[PDB]
RNA sequence: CAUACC
RNA sequence: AUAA
RNA sequence: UGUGGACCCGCCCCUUGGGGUGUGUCCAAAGGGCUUUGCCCGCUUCCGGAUGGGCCCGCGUCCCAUCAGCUAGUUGGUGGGGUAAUGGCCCACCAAGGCGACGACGGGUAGCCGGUCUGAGAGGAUGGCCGGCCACAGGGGCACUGAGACACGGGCCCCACUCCUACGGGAGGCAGCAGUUAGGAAUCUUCCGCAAUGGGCGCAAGCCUGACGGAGCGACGCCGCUUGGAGGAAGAAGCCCUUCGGGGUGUAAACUCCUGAACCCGGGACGAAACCCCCGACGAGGGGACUGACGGUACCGGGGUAAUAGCGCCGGCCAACUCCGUGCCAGCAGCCGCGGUAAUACGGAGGGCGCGAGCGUUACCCGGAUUCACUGGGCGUAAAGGGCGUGUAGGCGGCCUGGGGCGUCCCAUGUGAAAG
């Protein structure tokens, strides 16, 4: 997807299992288990107290590097979520989570988001029966996210959905397998996601 | 002489006209006396021509003169139809 | 509406013309304090009627000269020379304030 | 002051005189070298510092600094100055752009390359 | 001379309370009195009364404090924490009804003088006027 | 300590 | 004499 | 001919030269076309409407007081001329006025606005795209023609400059579209089309539009998109460090499978329905035909390749430390400051942080700067109380009652164009 580099060296910088890879991250790796310290020749010496700033910075990185998104595109969302009405923090989360590239991951078509990004850019994903090849596209509520009719018997997709048979998908998403079809029921609320981010902090970093 | 004509308001390749009354010597997209309807040629939406016959009729009644196009649109939205 | 100001004649030393002085109380933009502020108009006195000390209403009118765009609309109160003297000292002061000479 | 005084006089706004009359406002200005020199710093510094006296298309004679370890400027070299005081030589307010006109880019430099103005070392 | 007699009172009061007097005397005016009417009503004083010192007419204000306190310094909390003239001579301050200030989120008042008479902030807003903003009290 | 002059 |  | 209008005088209403009315005088026209006795397009006079303007007024509109006095058409009057029209707009004669510390006069700078940037706001800065107004068309004057001009691609004259010249004389005017050259840190194609919208003339067919709609160049700006996705060692090689055990780059690579930017093939637009023509009546209404610059583009369908990554930074402020080289040198540096032989600050390397078709730099504006303070500052010793008085203007002003309603407050209503 974007960033396109070593992802698990980011798991190892945030000191958190980030799952930027899905499958193997559940193995005995994700980088974290076995070697859970920072990347670089130095990331194993006694860590100095993070400045007030680093703390709020590293926390944003933790959120942005999850959804795999340019800072230019992250901040654009945050500012919008800011101007918007409601707890500007959770509206932000609502917005990231409303992204098509991510909703495809949530409905387990891809096993990662990097994989879900490409699944869209290569046109295997449809919204409301029309095709959408933009990771950015904002899913609204009531929309149905299908797997493209002529993409259905594809290898990467088959394994990915026989694995989805018998698994639960978020309380704000519908999903029927065999039909390769989801449904965006509602914008998730703050306690619906289990993100390892303070998020309150992310707001503070964008007013430094 | 005051006209009733299409002022250009879309964007590149996406044109939307704004049917207006204006002095015929104004620049095409300049200051007008009054808007009395709009019109998208590409019919991108279920509503793509609107008029307000009364204002259209009013202006005609005082010698507003419609371009051969605005007249078509005017006619089509039933501006003239007397039966 | 033809604008109508009320003022004080501070001059009739002029054929058929008075110099009405009009003041305006108003709150100051930035600082909010109320400041007076006043302006001299030349008014058309066609029948050399009003004399200095008169307090007159002045009316917006088609121009009689340059400077002259008002006609004296009516008389309010008369005789009050305080403001005339008021205005008169005001200019007598100017005698100092210079480089040259004159007791202000 | 009293309000009547602010009324009478008022606050006078602040003028902000430039640190760098490269006229025009302009980002940079071209000129010619009319001498390359070595200059001693002050304060607790010592070294030999490369400067130029430049005469500008601004019609201005200013003394620019010549950054980088290696430089190739001569008593008739045309050059592009660009503002940026050197903290140690008093009266040196502008820098010279390395990589523009007669001024060579620094040689065999690998780090802060675009200041100093050197291309991209090429290989596989 | 006494240039602002309202500030004189407002202050006279502020001064008295900070040394915890039982009462204080201001020389009298209906307008001063019409303010004390509000101070009293809204709970800031105990009330006042037209006394009479040396044959000239004063308004004795009766001040009001907290209970005695704990630790070092037992001097009680003040009731009139804060009280200050807004509009003054050579800077008169007038406000529309849409501009009458919410003092301390209403924990305090703002007496203003309107053509319906002297009034609190809540009073004018819920009565539709504006006027000369006299003073905040909190 | 490293320097600068008579 | 000068820099720490 | 006089519907009617204009002018003088009288009368009525009105109140500025507005609207009647009487006598007198004065003032009209143009023809053309056919489906040829009736239609179409024109012409004349008057009244009204619409639209566009002229002029006048209140208030608002940068800096210097190291610019304090300024003015002779100057200020007003009468009568004239002039104009669509008021007016010293201009003229004769008469009065001696007019303006100024509330900043006249002079100087400096500037097209103004809707807006734009910034700011919690008050404020500050700005007026570039777009829209409105003004001004200008090599420089300075001037009028003619017109409903309208003192007229950018109209006229005259004087000036400066380029060109032709038979030596007398003539010709030019990109601050229209492109384009050249010069100056500069720096700013595009001598492109396509009248298909759409708009304009001018024409009854129409049409014609004319470098207005305009499009394409072109430039990462200049915004937005979107790619350089892949899942697996993959208890962890290759090289380079780095080391307490000589090791530790790092690092799931990164290699490699396994999966999608398939680029690219190829096929279909292929919307924008365009009016003018015109036919029925009806040349109305309303119905039927018919023509027309695409962009463009074989957008978009749809099939085929299909693992397929660009840079730049800045890592002493503190400020996210990110280890070797080598250097030795107050070479250098860095936004500020404080680093370098004098063990440099996390200089130059390289490994590693790391931040953004990423960009990343840095310089320049400029607001911010933080309550650092011109109205919101929101100060002056005993930090900068700041005038050496002291007397007092002009100005600012401010005790208690009671009544009138007025200027300030102040309230209700209704008009205006606050579009764009933003
Ligand atoms: Mg600088
Ligand atoms: Mg550097
Ligand atoms: Mg007649
Ligand atoms: Mg007659
Ligand atoms: Mg009359
Ligand atoms: Mg008459
Ligand atoms: Mg005749
Ligand atoms: Mg005939
Ligand atoms: Mg009109
Ligand atoms: Mg005279
Ligand atoms: Mg006259
Ligand atoms: Mg005259
Ligand atoms: Mg001036
Ligand atoms: Mg200009
Ligand atoms: Mg403004
Ligand atoms: Mg501020
Ligand atoms: Mg421009
Ligand atoms: Mg402009
Ligand atoms: Mg020119
Ligand atoms: Mg031309
Ligand atoms: Mg050049
Ligand atoms: Mg055309
Ligand atoms: Mg046309
Ligand atoms: Mg991989
Ligand atoms: Mg395929
Ligand atoms: Mg394949
Ligand atoms: Mg045609
Ligand atoms: Mg017929
Ligand atoms: Mg028809
Ligand atoms: Mg590859
Ligand atoms: Mg740090
Ligand atoms: Mg060692
Ligand atoms: Mg050396
Ligand atoms: Mg060393
Ligand atoms: Mg050392
Ligand atoms: Mg280093
Ligand atoms: Mg540094
Ligand atoms: Mg800020
Ligand atoms: Mg400020
Ligand atoms: Mg201070
Ligand atoms: Mg001292
Ligand atoms: Mg001092
Ligand atoms: Mg003293
Ligand atoms: Mg003195
Ligand atoms: Mg002194
Ligand atoms: Mg005194
Ligand atoms: Mg006095
Ligand atoms: Mg008074
Ligand atoms: Mg009083
Ligand atoms: Mg009274
Ligand atoms: Mg009133
Ligand atoms: Mg608007
Ligand atoms: Zn992982």
D5 interfaces chain E, CB cutoff of 8 Å: no
| All residues at 6 or more sequence positions from E132 whose CB lies less than 8 Å from its CB, including other chains | E87, E92, E93, E94, E112, E113, E114
SS3 content of chain C, % helix, strand, coil (to 5): 15, 40, 45
Domains in chain A (CATH in brackets) are 1-96+194-208 (1.10.1050.10), 97-193 (3.10.290.10)
**Spatial contact of E91 and D6, defined as CB atoms under 8 Å apart:** no
Q: Is the CB of A43 under 7 A from strand H?
A: yes
- Give resolution in angstroms: 3.2
**What are the structural domains, with CATH classification, of chain B?**
1-83 (3.30.1320.10)
- The CATH number assigned to the domain with range E81-138 reads 3.30.1490.10
- Burial code (b: 16+ CB inside 10 Å, e: under 16) for D92-102 equals bbbbbbbbbee
**Token pair listed for B75:** 């006619």
- Is residue E29 classed exposed, middle or buried when 0-12, 13-18 and 19+ CB atoms within 10 A define those classes? middle
Sheet-wide strand order for E56-62: E23-27, E56-62, E47-53
Residue E84 is inside which H or E element, if any? strand E83-85
CA C1 to C1' H414, whole Å: 13
Element (H, E) at B71: helix B68-76
Q: Which CATH architecture has domain E3-80?
A: 2-Layer Sandwich (3.30)
Residues 87-116 of E with CB under 7 A from strand H: 89-90, 92, 94-98, 114-115
Evaluated on CA atoms B19, B20, B23, B26, the torsion sign reads: negative
Whether the CB-CB separation of A110 and A104 falls below 8 Å is answered with: yes
CA D81 to the chain's CA centroid = 6
Copy the structure tokens of residue D88: 């140690």
The Cα–Cα gap between C50 and C14 comes to: 12
Way the structure was solved: X-ray
Q: In terms of Cα–Cα distance, which of E107, E104, E124 is closest to E44?
A: E107
Dist CA A38 CA A48 (whole Å): 13
- Kindly write down the DSSP assignment for every residue of chain A, as one continuous string: --S-S-SHHHHHHHTS---SSSSGGGSS-SSSSSS-S-SSTTTTSPPPPPPHHHHHHHHHHHHHHHHT--HHHHHHHHHHHHHSSS-HHHHHHHHHHTBHHHHHHHTTSSSSHHHHHHHHHTT-EEETTEE---TT-B--TT--EEE-GGGTT-HHHHHHHHTTTT----TTEEEETTTTEEEE--PPPTTTS--S---HHHHHHTT-
| Domain of C82, in residue numbers | 1-104
Q: Residue B2: helix, strand or coil by DSSP?
A: strand
CA nearest E91 in D: which residue?
D3
Nearest alpha carbon to residue D117 among D101, D96, D99, D103: D99
**CA pair distance B15, B39, nearest whole angstrom:** 9
Residue intervals in chain E for CATH 3.30.1370.30: 3-80
- Ligand number nearest to the C-alpha of D78: 21
Question: What DSSP designation does C18 have?
Answer: E
A11 annotated ligand binder: yes
How many domains, in total, are found in chain C?
1
Where do breaks (C to N over 2.5 Å) occur in chain A, by preceding residue number? none
């Amino acid at each position: 997807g974007r960033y396109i580099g070593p992802v698990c060296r980011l798991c190892r910088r945030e000191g958190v299992k980030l799952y930027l890879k899905g499958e193997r991250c559940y193995s005995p790796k994700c980088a974290m288990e076995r070697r859970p310290y920072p990347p670089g020749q130095h990331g194993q010496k006694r860590a100095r107290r993070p400045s007030d700033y680093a703390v709020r910075l590293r926390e944003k990185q933790k959120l942005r590097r999850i959804y795999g998104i340019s800072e230019r595109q992250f901040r654009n969302l945050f500012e919008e979520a800011s101007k918007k009405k409601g707890v500007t923090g959770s509206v932000f989360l609502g917005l990231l989570e409303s992204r098509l590239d991510n909703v495809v991951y949530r409905l387990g078509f891809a096993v990662s988001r990097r994989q879900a990004r490409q699944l869209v850019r290569h046109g295997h994903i449809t919204v409301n029966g029309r095709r959408v090849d933009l990771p950015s596209y904002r899913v609204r509520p009531g929309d149905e996210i299908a797997v493209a009719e002529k993409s259905r018997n594809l290898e990467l997709i088959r394994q990915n959905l026989e694995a989805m048979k018998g698994r639960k998908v978020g309380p704000w998403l519908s999903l029927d397998v065999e039909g390769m079809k989801g449904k965006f029921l509602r914008l998730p609320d703050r306690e619906d996601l289990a993100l390892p981010v303070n998020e309150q902090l992310v707001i503070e970093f964008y007013s430094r | 002489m005051v006209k009733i004509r299409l002022a250009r308001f879309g964007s590149k390749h996406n044109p939307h006209y704004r049917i207006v009354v204006t002095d015929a010597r104004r620049k095409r997209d300049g200051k007008y006396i009054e808007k009395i309807g709009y019109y998208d040629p590409r019919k991108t939406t279920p509503d793509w021509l609107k008029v307000d016959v009364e204002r259209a009729r009013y202006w005609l009644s005082v010698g507003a003169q419609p371009t051969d196009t605005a007249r078509r649109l005017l006619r089509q939205a039933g501006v003239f139809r007397q039966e | 509406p033809k604008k109508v100001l009320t003022g004080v004649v501070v001059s009739d030393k002029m054929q058929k013309t008075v110099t009405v002085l009009v003041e305006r109380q108003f709150p100051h933009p930035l600082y909010g304090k109320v400041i007076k502020r006043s302006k001299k108009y030349l008014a058309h006195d066609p029948e050399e009627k009003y004399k200095l000390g008169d307090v007159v209403e002045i009316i917006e009118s088609r121009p009689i000269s340059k400077r002259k765009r008002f006609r004296v609309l009516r008389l309010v109160e008369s005789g009050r020379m305080d403001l005339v003297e008021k205005y008169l000292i005001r200019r007598q002061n100017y005698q100092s304030l210079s480089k040259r000479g004159g007791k202000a | 002051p009293t309000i009547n005084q602010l009324v009478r006089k008022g606050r006078e706004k602040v003028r902000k005189k430039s640190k760098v009359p490269a006229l025009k406002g302009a980002p940079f200005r071209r000129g010619v070298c009319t001498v390359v020199r070595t200059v001693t710093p002050k304060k607790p510094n010592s070294a030999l510092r490369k400067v130029a006296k430049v005469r500008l298309t601004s019609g201005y004679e200013v003394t620019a600094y010549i950054p980088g370890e290696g430089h190739n400027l001569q008593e008739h070299s045309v050059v592009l100055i660009r503002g940026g005081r050197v903290k140690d030589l008093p009266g040196v307010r502008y820098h010279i752009v390395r990589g523009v006109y007669d001024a060579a880019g620094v040689k065999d430099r690998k780090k802060s390359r675009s200041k100093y103005g050197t291309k991209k070392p090429k290989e596989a | 001379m006494l240039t602002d007699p309202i500030a004189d009172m407002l202050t006279r009061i502020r001064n008295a309370t900070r040394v915890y007097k039982e009462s204080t005397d201001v020389p009298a005016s209906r307008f001063k009195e019409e303010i004390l009417r509000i101070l009293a009503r809204e709970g800031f004083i105990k009330g006042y009364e037209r006394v009479d010192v040396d044959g000239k007419p004063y308004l004795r204000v009766y001040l009001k404090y907290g209970p005695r306190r704990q630790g070092p310094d037992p001097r009680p909390e003040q009731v009139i924490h804060h009280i200050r003239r807004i509009s003054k001579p050579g800077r008169r301050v007038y406000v529309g009804v849409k501009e009458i200030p919410r003092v301390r989120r209403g924990l305090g008042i703002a007496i203003l003088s309107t053509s319906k008479g002297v009034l609190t902030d809540r009073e004018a807003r819920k009565l539709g006027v504006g006027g000369e903003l006299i003073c905040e009290v909190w």
